[PDB]
Amino acid sequence: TTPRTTLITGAAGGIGQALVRRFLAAGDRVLALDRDRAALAAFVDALGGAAVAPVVDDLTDAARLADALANERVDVLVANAGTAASATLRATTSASWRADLDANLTATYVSVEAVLAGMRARRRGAITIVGSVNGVAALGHPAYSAAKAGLISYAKSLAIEYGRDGVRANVVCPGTVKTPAWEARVRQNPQVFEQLKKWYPLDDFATPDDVANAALFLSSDAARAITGAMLPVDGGLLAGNRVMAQELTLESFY
Amino acid sequence: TTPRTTLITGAAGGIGQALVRRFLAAGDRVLALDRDRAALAAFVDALGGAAVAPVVDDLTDAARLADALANERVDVLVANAGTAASATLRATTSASWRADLDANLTATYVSVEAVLAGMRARRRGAITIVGSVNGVAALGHPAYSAAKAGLISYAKSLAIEYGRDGVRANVVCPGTVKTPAWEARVRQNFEQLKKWYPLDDFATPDDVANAALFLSSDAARAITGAMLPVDGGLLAGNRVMAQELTLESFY
Ligand code: NA
Secondary structure (H helix, E strand, O other), X not given: OOOOEEEEEOOOOHHHHHHHHHHHHOOOEEEEEEOOHHHHHHHHHHOOOOOEEEEEOOOOOHHHHHHHOOOOOOOEXXXXXXXXXXXXXXXXXXXXHXXXXXXXXXXXXXXXXXXXXXHHHOXXXXXXXXXXXXXXXXXXXXXXXXXXXXXXXXXHHHHHHHHHHOEEEEEEEEOOEOOHHHHHHHHHOOOHHHHHHHHOOOOOOEOHHHHHHHHHHHOOHHHOOOOOOEEEXXXXXXXXXXXXXXXXXXXXXX | OOOOEXXXXXXXXXXXXXXXXXXXXXXXEEEEEEOOHHHHHHHHHHHOOOOEEEEEOOOOOHHHHHHHOOOOOOOEEEEOOOXXXXXXXXXXXXXXXXXXXXXXXXXHHHHHHOOHHHHHHHOOEEEEEEOOHHHOOOOOOHHHHHHHHHHHHHHHHHHHHHHHHOEEEEEEEEOOEOOHHHHHHHHHOOHHHXXXXXXXXXXXXXXXXHHHXXXXXXXXXXXXXXEEEEOOOHHHOOHHHHHHHHOOOOO
16 A cells, blocks of 8 residues: 555666656655765756655665665665776776776675665565676676676576575666766767667667666566566677678678 | 557467467457467457457468468567477487477477568567577476577577567576466476475466566567576576585575
């Protein structure tokens, strides 16, 4: 008789806002978590009085977060916080390597640990991690990629250990999605997006809404038998390489 | 304005019937294809006048099936036909090996080729293949498993070649499924199988159908070439071995 409660991290970012809007549309109470207080408050204002409550937290302390959530009973975690730092190993430092691991892998561990006890107590929980195709194939951003590969491992570890408690854990792996994370690259090469279309079999990129739709599905009773899964939402990117296939077959693929 | 048309193969089996019911519930006109005419007749009768039409076909002839579909505009194919013959390589013969390849891999090729040209001409199609966890990990039924691994490859080949035509191709991989036949077998005595599954329960036919429906929908319009396990966590690892390696209980 009360709304399902969903905690969504990185809520003020491009995919995060789409996640919040989609789960709100599905009838959830959404706890929108972001480290950026001003950006989060503005998004909450824009939502117009929805069933949303902001949480300002940087995902470095699970016990602090759990205490902040003491009046809530979180049924679903969408673990979406985490951005890439260095784009190549050449550009990577030990510090930026460690920082990408903390922000993209350990932040998710912290998010899970803040809500997992209640899920297990109620024998009901869905953990839906937003990963990346970079966690599966070498495409750049190497510390980020290693962290996102670790998230796939972590989802599977969660799945086998807590499935007996009715908790499911899955990873959605987006390809290129148009978010503010691309602003610097678009300013450097304004044709980056059109040059990228050739790699994608669907000749277009997933949108933030497309990612949110997959997260909603995996978080729902329509996926109650799905756990430990990696679902790419990537316009077909991980299936292969249609640009190389065209060169290999001398037939038109794109 | 007219209903989306979905072709579902192996429609009279446990998973196939759940697929037909789920897609009918979603508003589709469903073409229910099965080799067993009497089973199709019984199923159509049980559906009670829904937007369903039977197709009796054994998936050995793509042209024959395409012509049977000449007055249809199939938008979605759920390729579900195919069962396993031999349980082990010891039990397998060259003939049973080839028969499993034809029934579980080429039958899907035939099903796709019967509808793909129209999907391309209309720039709209979703191909949703029902595979198996056996196509990903070695669990027995070896020719079946090789065929099901081939289906994952075939979906990826479809995805990269026909994405430009607005056609998507994906694979749902079930583990053990609680079909009516399975329930009847279990009622004869199988609880030793639950230990392998993290969710401590098996997928139902409707669970598989829900995944097929999602992948066939606009909510998955950016998903192609994907393998989605509907397996209660079976492919994630091995919680029985994990218990022995960690000396802690996992179930
Ligand atoms: Na292939």
